[PDB]
Amino acid sequence: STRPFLVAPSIANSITTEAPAINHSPELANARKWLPKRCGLITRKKGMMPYFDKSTGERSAATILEVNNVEVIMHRTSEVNGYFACQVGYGSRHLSKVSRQMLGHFASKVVNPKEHVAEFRVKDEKGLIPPGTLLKPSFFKEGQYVDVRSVSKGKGFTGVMKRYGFKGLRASHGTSIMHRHGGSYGQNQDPGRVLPGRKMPGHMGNEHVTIQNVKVLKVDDENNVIWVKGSVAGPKNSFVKIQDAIKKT
Amino acid sequence: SQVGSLPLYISPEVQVSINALSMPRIIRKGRTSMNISQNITVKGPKGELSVEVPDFLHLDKDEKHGKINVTVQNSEDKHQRSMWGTVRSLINNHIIGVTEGHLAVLRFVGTGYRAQLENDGKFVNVKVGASIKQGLDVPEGIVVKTPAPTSLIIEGCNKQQVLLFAAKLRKFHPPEPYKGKGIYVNDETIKLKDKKIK
Amino acid sequence: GGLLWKIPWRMSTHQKTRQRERLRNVDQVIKQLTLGLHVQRCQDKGLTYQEAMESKKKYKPRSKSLRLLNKPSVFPKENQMSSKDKYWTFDKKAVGYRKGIHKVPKWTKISIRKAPKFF
Amino acid sequence: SQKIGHSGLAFARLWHHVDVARDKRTLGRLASAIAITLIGRHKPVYHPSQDCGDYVVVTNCQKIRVTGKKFEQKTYWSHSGRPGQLKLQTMNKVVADKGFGEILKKAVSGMLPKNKLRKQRLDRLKVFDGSENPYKQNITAFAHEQSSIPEPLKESIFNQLK
Amino acid sequence: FKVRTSVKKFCSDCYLVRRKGRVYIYCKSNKKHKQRQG
RNA sequence: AGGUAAAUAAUCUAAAGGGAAACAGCCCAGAUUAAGAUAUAAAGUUCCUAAUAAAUAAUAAGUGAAAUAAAUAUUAAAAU
RNA sequence: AAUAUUUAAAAUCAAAUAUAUAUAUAUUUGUUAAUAGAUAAUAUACGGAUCUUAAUAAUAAGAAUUAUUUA
RNA sequence: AGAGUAGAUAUUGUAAGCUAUGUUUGCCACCUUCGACUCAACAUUUCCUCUUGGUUGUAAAAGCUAAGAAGGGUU
RNA sequence: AAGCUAAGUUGAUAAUAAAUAAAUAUUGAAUACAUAUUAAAUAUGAAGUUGUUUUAAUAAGAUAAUUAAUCUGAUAAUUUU
Ligand SMILES: [Mg+2]
Ligand SMILES: [Mg+2]
Ligand SMILES: [Mg+2]
Ligand SMILES: [Mg+2]
Ligand SMILES: [Mg+2]
Ligand SMILES: [Mg+2]
Ligand SMILES: [Mg+2]
Ligand SMILES: [Mg+2]
Ligand SMILES: [Mg+2]
Ligand SMILES: [Mg+2]
Ligand SMILES: [Mg+2]
Ligand SMILES: [Mg+2]
Ligand SMILES: [Mg+2]
Ligand SMILES: [Mg+2]
Ligand SMILES: [Mg+2]
Ligand SMILES: [Mg+2]
Ligand SMILES: [Mg+2]
Ligand SMILES: [Mg+2]
Ligand SMILES: [Mg+2]
Ligand SMILES: [Mg+2]
């Protein structure tokens, strides 16, 4: 019960006042952000096929996005994590491939070992979907607009001509060996150095890409596919995050 | 000092009281400063109103003859006696507001220029000419009435607010010197230019 | 233009105080020289040191340099000088016909006390 | 002879509290005092090669005193190294972004010596805009001061810790 | 607005003004006389 | 013009040390070798950085605070 | 309290020095501020921090600017 | 000062006055490649795009002049 | 044929909001009058600012297992996403 402790008069008599809100704080940042009011899906890009409108005959390319065992694993909240998000898991995996720690995690959350896990940030708590619920393609509406995020194809160590569209030099008129080079990469003694961000040859691709306002053309559950007008970043069998568009509806 | 030294005549139906607050707010300047912790309240038949006044200004009552005076400690301070004059003017204006009221008449000169009231008399719509609807909503303490589409009456108990709302409405279309066109706040007028086409 | 001789155009309080003390020191040197001459005159006439110092009549110097230095109109004492002439010296190539006394070479050794009446 | 004895008390990092609500010094003057404390000049056992500084806790920084129009005019600079990237933020904006104590932290950092000990002396300063801090128990107190403090205040400072 | 370092009062209806750390002249009669001390 | 040509000092040239942020030429002072108690020069004494306490007025423009930018314009101060 | 050149210590006035003890001659000093005009190119540059103060209110701050000075 | 149907100050401002830049032609003597192609970074003394004041000389349209403005653009 | 590619296909030019510049106002004195303030109070206002959107790098924080014949990585083999 009683223990020896001493109190400083300055602290004891200090008047209590509340510190003001600073912009560089999760609460204010979350208030400022531009986020959807609903959770999304994880899909696996399967490839592209034609889409023919039965009525007007329009033909448009469409990517096929597979929905396979998409379940909500757990939630994130403002009072515990600083933002509202739904962690979603896609697919089925094998014991041998999943680790013991993550096997315990999936067991605790009452889901099967998952191919992929990624979390979608919602605006508030109304958009959190209960854990363990299976999400189907019909989760989206025909003719609505979504945003798709995925890692794009790798192009390797790419030169300046391909990477940034430099014109290079002439193929004739005395041009010396350096045909496909970027030219000058700075100025004379005044800078005395190459400014940061100078465009130079280097690895291109394997980078995240967000494509906004992609139209959902067809949704069906008997095949477990979602049709997206246009193209999606990444090779085949690449994971894609689909979520309602923030700009158009 | 001449403005602030003029006394105030208060009718039996209007009363003025002065009190203090809990949080004195102290505003700063260069070598000078101000501290504000008092409040004056005017009550009358047409509602109630209030003003914030510093601690260096006091009100002397007189029930006989219904007379009240406003004075500060040190008139040697220019930055004090200016406030004394302004506070006298403000309290007097509030007294006029409560006893009688403040009114402003907007005239809409120009063909098709007219104003209407919508949303239970809260919104005012003006047609000074635009492909987009124009107007705004009245603030608290102001009431508007339209005897004619081409005329509008804005009145209340706070002179500053009534006239600021009038000016905000006028901002959409001030008078045009070539042909009289726009919103006229009061009896004030403009001088027109000759035609003298080239 | 090219070299940076970063000499500010106005002195500081400490510099002014040191200048005042230096002026006072020169005044003291002049005073002591005159007093020594007076005491020597008294001792030559016969008196001794004590009443040479206590003598009511003080002998004035007979040399041109000492007499002129003792005249206030030629070598004014520190307390007699003006604040302007304590710190600023006369120059005919400067705006205002003045320059800081600290821009004079070897200003802590050389002495300036008087400038033209109307400058 | 004077040096021979128990130096453990001498080289002890005390914790000091400065309540800006009660303090009357302005930003720069308060910061100069804080820098002196952090360096440890106030200790007669100070030697330049050693870091004899103490901890400092500042509370109620939202009442700090700044003179003139510095709040709306003083600018803080930052440049990464790429030309055209000179961030200039007014004190008002820096306060709204990172708080009032950030200004004091910059002032103290400027007044500290430019050594390898600069950052470890700076991290020794704890600043809080409000009164709620986790170092209420980490403040020098003596048994002879407890008389003025009422019992419920002691119970609050003991049991209601963060 | 005649922005100029020399600000005068031409029309007798000109009036001086002290705003935004600057000196202004506004004329009630002739609008050409508006000036600002830049 | 950090130009050029000569005329009086002084310093660098051939001069370390303190101040001028950094500094051949400016302010002070001339290192035989040490010691570190005392009096100091120029310059300074909120912190970086050794060392300060006051009086009387003015400034509110961060003016200014160790490299004063002009004619002019506005707003303010007293003598009859 | 109103019409109101000039920005002054020459002249006048007021304090002090050297001769003079009932008073005079000579000498020394004391006469405005703020803003605007303002002004480029890797990066804001008093060397940097920073510097103007405020009752309640605690050991305890209130130029670190300019002009005369004291200890 | 003078033009501007009238009025020096919408615009305009002719000899002279006070300053700013260090892009021009020169001056000193500390220090013995012009154009094109490619990629450009920076400034604002803003050509276009946005906000605004003036204009017997802004009825509308198109303009002239000026204040804020370097985000984007500028064969 | 696959792949790469553009002459081809798809999408975007990242809001809504908050303070402002020039500039436009209400009440109002010191200074009877006048004055939007280089007084106290009360409002409008830009492709610019803060932000937002997009992509790097960081991991505060969170779930889970914790000496294991199916605990976590590596060396190794068959390979491209
Ligand atoms: Mg080619
Ligand atoms: Mg060759
Ligand atoms: Mg070839
Ligand atoms: Mg080269
Ligand atoms: Mg030469
Ligand atoms: Mg020599
Ligand atoms: Mg030689
Ligand atoms: Mg030397
Ligand atoms: Mg220094
Ligand atoms: Mg040095
Ligand atoms: Mg400055
Ligand atoms: Mg005289
Ligand atoms: Mg610069
Ligand atoms: Mg003419
Ligand atoms: Mg000419
Ligand atoms: Mg500009
Ligand atoms: Mg037009
Ligand atoms: Mg009035
Ligand atoms: Mg008006
Ligand atoms: Mg805008």
Side-chain angles (χ1 to χ4, degrees):
Chain A
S1 178
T2 39
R3 293 271 141 161
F5 83 85
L6 298 188
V7 179
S10 185
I11 290 288
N13 324 125
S14 180
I15 211 176
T16 285
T17 183
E18 296 178 353
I22 48 154
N23 289 343
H24 294 183
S25 85
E27 53 197 348
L28 264 59
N30 195 48
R32 292 181 322 231
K33 248 82 191 187
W34 188 6
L35 306 160
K37 314 163 271 312
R38 273 211 320 161
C39 178
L41 299 183
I42 291 169
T43 60
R44 204 191 260 261
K45 174 184 178 183
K46 279 299 185 181
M48 311 204 29
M49 304 198 341
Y51 188 72
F52 287 100
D53 211 23
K54 296 293 191 213
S55 295
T56 60
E58 200 156 339
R59 182 215 186 263
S60 39
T63 67
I64 308 307
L65 301 173
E66 181 190 5
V67 179
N68 174 18
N69 281 288
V70 177
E71 275 161 313
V72 180
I73 291 165
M74 61 146 268
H75 295 168
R76 302 215 187 282
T77 36
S78 167
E79 57 270 29
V80 181
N81 290 129
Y83 63 102
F84 284 109
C86 275
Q87 196 186 66
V88 173
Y90 169 106
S92 64
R93 213 170 171 81
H94 196 272
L95 281 293
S96 303
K97 321 289 179 46
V98 183
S99 62
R100 177 174 177 88
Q101 298 99 302
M102 281 305 268
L103 287 171
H105 168 55
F106 292 131
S108 71
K109 299 307 163 290
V110 194
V111 294
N112 68 285
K114 242 67 187 174
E115 276 308 60
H116 195 243
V117 183
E119 64 171 54
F120 302 80
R121 188 172 177 174
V122 300
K123 162 158 287 292
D124 68 51
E125 81 276 20
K126 165 53 211 83
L128 268 56
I129 290 313
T133 64
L134 179 90
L135 296 167
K136 292 165 157 282
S138 65
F139 181 78
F140 299 112
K141 222 277 185 202
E142 191 186 300
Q144 83 164 40
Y145 292 99
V146 292
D147 311 353
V148 298
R149 315 181 151 200
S150 62
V151 186
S152 63
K153 270 179 162 182
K155 306 280 154 58
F157 197 104
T158 61
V160 288
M161 291 205 48
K162 176 170 186 39
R163 195 183 180 193
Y164 296 120
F166 289 4
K167 320 178 181 57
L169 306 182
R170 290 83 60 90
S172 185
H173 287 295
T175 300
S176 283
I177 52 175
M178 311 166 39
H179 290 280
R180 301 185 62 92
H181 284 226
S184 173
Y185 283 95
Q187 310 136 352
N188 201 337
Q189 181 175 203
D190 177 34
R193 74 211 172 85
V194 175
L195 308 187
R198 194 81 171 171
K199 288 165 187 77
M200 282 169 162
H203 170 271
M204 191 189 31
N206 237 345
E207 263 285 359
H208 280 267
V209 175
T210 299
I211 313 176
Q212 293 154 55
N213 299 355
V214 317
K215 190 197 220 299
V216 175
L217 294 160
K218 173 165 168 203
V219 61
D220 68 14
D221 302 340
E222 80 173 51
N223 289 314
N224 317 284
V225 292
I226 294 184
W227 298 49
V228 160
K229 176 191 187 185
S231 62
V232 167
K236 315 152 301 283
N237 258 42
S238 64
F239 296 110
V240 182
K241 296 176 61 179
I242 308 156
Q243 178 167 33
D244 308 283
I246 46 167
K247 302 218 173 102
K248 274 193 281 273
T249 74
Chain B
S1 175
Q2 210 181 303
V3 168
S5 176
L6 212 63
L8 300 174
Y9 43 98
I10 60 169
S11 197
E13 72 275 18
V14 60
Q15 293 177 335
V16 186
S17 67
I18 197 177
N19 61 5
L21 282 84
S22 299
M23 188 61 286
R25 54 160 160 240
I26 312 190
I27 62 180
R28 303 308 211 277
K29 184 178 179 180
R31 290 217 309 272
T32 62
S33 164
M34 291 215 198
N35 69 306
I36 319 183
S37 165
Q38 316 189 90
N39 170 19
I40 316 158
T41 65
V42 178
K43 276 80 178 204
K46 310 193 60 182
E48 296 85 357
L49 195 56
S50 67
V51 183
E52 285 280 295
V53 65
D55 311 349
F56 68 74
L57 178 48
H58 323 274
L59 186 49
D60 183 67
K61 293 179 179 179
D62 201 340
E63 69 291 344
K64 181 174 74 148
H65 299 170
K67 175 153 301 313
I68 65 179
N69 299 339
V70 284
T71 41
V72 294
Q73 296 102 15
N74 171 59
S75 181
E76 304 290 354
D77 187 357
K78 183 178 179 179
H79 160 287
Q80 210 186 343
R81 83 183 200 251
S82 54
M83 283 297 306
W84 158 40
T86 298
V87 172
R88 190 269 181 191
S89 182
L90 263 63
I91 199 67
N92 175 327
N93 251 337
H94 285 216
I95 286 198
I96 319 155
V98 279
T99 192
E100 183 178 2
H102 300 284
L103 188 147
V105 294
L106 306 187
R107 325 287 298 288
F108 290 73
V109 187
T111 206
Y113 281 37
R114 84 183 201 62
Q116 178 58 33
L117 285 136
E118 322 63 46
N119 173 335
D120 308 352
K122 282 216 300 183
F123 202 75
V124 182
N125 173 87
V126 58
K127 283 195 69 52
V128 290
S131 57
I132 189 166
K133 183 260 288 179
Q134 275 185 354
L136 71 172
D137 41 347
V138 306
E140 68 276 15
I142 288 177
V143 61
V144 171
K145 293 179 179 179
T146 44
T150 315
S151 180
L152 192 145
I153 314 303
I154 311 166
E155 63 185 342
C157 179
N158 190 340
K159 190 173 164 197
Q160 186 272 158
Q161 285 300 142
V162 58
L163 280 162
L164 180 63
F165 188 75
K168 198 183 295 187
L169 278 166
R170 191 193 102 148
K171 211 166 170 292
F172 293 134
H173 198 311
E176 170 42 61
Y178 292 115
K179 296 170 59 172
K181 269 187 164 199
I183 307 185
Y184 296 69
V185 185
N186 266 325
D187 198 29
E188 60 82 13
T189 56
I190 187 167
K191 293 179 179 179
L192 292 91
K193 301 187 176 186
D194 194 352
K195 195 162 162 73
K196 197 177 284 184
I197 291 174
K198 288 79 178 177
Chain C
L3 280 304
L4 177 40
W5 298 106
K6 204 168 72 171
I7 299 169
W9 74 276
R10 54 161 161 240
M11 263 159 52
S12 66
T13 46
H14 305 113
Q15 283 174 304
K16 291 172 182 177
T17 302
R18 293 184 217 100
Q19 178 65 358
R20 271 180 263 136
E21 311 148 355
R22 286 194 294 264
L23 278 161
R24 262 193 295 263
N25 283 356
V26 173
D27 289 346
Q28 184 67 0
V29 168
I30 295 175
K31 164 192 221 183
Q32 289 293 313
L33 285 173
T34 64
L35 152 72
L37 277 174
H38 153 72
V39 176
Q40 180 70 321
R41 291 265 285 291
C42 296
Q43 290 200 290
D44 290 334
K45 287 187 182 309
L47 303 165
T48 191
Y49 193 93
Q50 200 79 322
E51 56 262 43
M53 310 285 327
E54 293 177 350
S55 178
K56 162 62 181 189
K57 293 179 179 179
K58 310 287 183 169
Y59 290 96
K60 312 291 183 187
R62 304 264 51 84
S63 179
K64 194 202 311 213
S65 45
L66 277 299
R67 196 187 45 79
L68 279 172
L69 276 173
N70 282 287
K71 294 183 33 54
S73 54
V74 172
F75 197 84
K77 263 181 97 213
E78 191 274 8
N79 58 349
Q80 287 175 37
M81 276 170 78
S82 35
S83 46
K84 313 322 163 273
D85 289 345
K86 280 182 193 180
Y87 316 119
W88 306 89
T89 185
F90 171 73
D91 184 2
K92 58 165 81 182
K93 328 173 298 304
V95 48
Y97 292 145
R98 293 261 171 180
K99 59 182 287 188
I101 194 163
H102 65 293
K103 302 219 208 85
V104 177
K106 282 78 188 166
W107 74 292
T108 77
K109 305 153 181 279
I110 197 54
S111 34
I112 307 105
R113 302 283 187 116
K114 254 282 161 183
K117 174 43 81 163
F118 293 127
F119 293 79
Chain D
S1 164
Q2 296 109 282
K3 320 207 305 177
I4 301 171
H6 282 337
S7 317
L9 283 302
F11 304 108
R13 267 142 171 72
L14 294 187
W15 294 62
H16 306 284
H17 183 227
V18 283
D19 192 326
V20 187
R22 300 312 295 256
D23 195 301
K24 307 196 162 167
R25 272 167 310 189
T26 195
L27 164 72
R29 305 178 189 264
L30 179 61
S32 178
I34 290 154
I36 272 285
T37 297
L38 290 175
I39 295 162
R41 301 299 302 278
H42 64 297
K43 307 190 160 166
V45 307
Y46 170 88
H47 188 274
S49 67
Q50 203 164 50
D51 184 19
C52 313
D54 296 322
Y55 293 78
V56 181
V57 185
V58 193
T59 62
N60 300 331
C61 295
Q62 43 164 340
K63 313 266 162 224
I64 215 181
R65 297 191 182 193
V66 174
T67 64
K69 303 186 216 136
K70 293 177 200 166
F71 209 79
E72 309 193 311
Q73 286 198 4
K74 192 183 197 308
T75 48
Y76 287 91
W77 75 273
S78 181
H79 203 292
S80 47
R82 177 204 313 263
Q85 297 309 339
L86 181 64
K87 300 332 86 180
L88 282 181
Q89 333 205 327
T90 297
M91 171 175 297
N92 194 335
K93 180 54 145 270
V94 176
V95 166
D97 266 342
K98 295 216 245 168
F100 277 93
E102 183 52 26
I103 308 295
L104 186 56
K105 196 141 200 312
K106 282 194 260 312
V108 173
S109 34
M111 295 166 203
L112 280 175
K114 314 303 181 300
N115 294 337
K116 303 169 196 266
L117 310 166
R118 194 201 162 136
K119 264 193 271 193
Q120 81 179 16
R121 277 157 166 180
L122 189 57
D123 76 10
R124 198 99 48 68
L125 168 68
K126 321 295 193 182
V127 281
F128 299 94
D129 296 342
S131 90
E132 192 285 300
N133 73 57
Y135 312 119
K136 286 180 178 179
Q137 284 159 299
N138 302 36
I139 293 297
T140 325
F142 291 81
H144 68 79
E145 308 180 286
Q146 313 303 283
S147 306
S148 69
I149 309 179
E151 172 70 46
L153 269 179
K154 293 179 195 159
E155 174 60 25
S156 300
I157 296 302
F158 177 51
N159 212 340
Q160 305 290 338
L161 60 84
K162 178 202 171 184
Chain E
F1 241 117
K2 292 177 167 55
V3 182
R4 50 187 61 179
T5 75
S6 196
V7 285
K8 293 179 179 179
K9 294 212 320 203
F10 313 120
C11 78
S12 63
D13 313 293
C14 284
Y15 58 96
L16 186 74
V17 158
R18 315 281 290 309
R19 295 170 192 157
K20 324 187 201 166
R22 281 186 303 262
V23 176
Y24 295 88
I25 310 292
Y26 289 82
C27 178
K28 274 212 72 193
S29 82
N30 192 307
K31 293 179 179 179
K32 293 186 175 187
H33 302 174
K34 296 173 55 174
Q35 305 148 68
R36 170 182 139 201
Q37 224 193 356

